[PDB]
Amino acid sequence: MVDAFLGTWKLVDSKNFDDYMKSLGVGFATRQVASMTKPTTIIEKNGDILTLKTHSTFKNTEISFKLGVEFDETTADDRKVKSIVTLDGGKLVHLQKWDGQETTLVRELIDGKLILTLTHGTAVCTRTYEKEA
Ligand SMILES: CCCCCC(=O)O
8 A cells, every 4th residue: 555655755856846836825935945945755654644754954844644534734834724645546645625725745656756746726746756765
């Protein structure tokens, strides 16, 4: 199920992150810092509890969740959202809801790389992560 996602991942490419951040209403000064940042994502499991850490020189987040169980999340850009993470077609789909809006964060393994697709409104961002061993 989730075991191929587990580990430490480092960003190696990013397309259209600015467009996604603009769509969410992130201010120009935070978008500048975010365009140069190369986060590390750590995904860990303990039984049926996942933990997802995102580390960087700018901002750090951590969430723990069970698949298929809604949780409260405060995002890096300070949205208060209702979240759920599920396995769909082998992808890890994270849906965030707030104020009648949605965004999806979809993680898929392709050729040993982690591809993160971020959709909000018309904005689509693809991030590519490589595994640190
Ligand atoms: C608004 C949060 C963006 C997360 C982007 C990433 O994990 O690469």
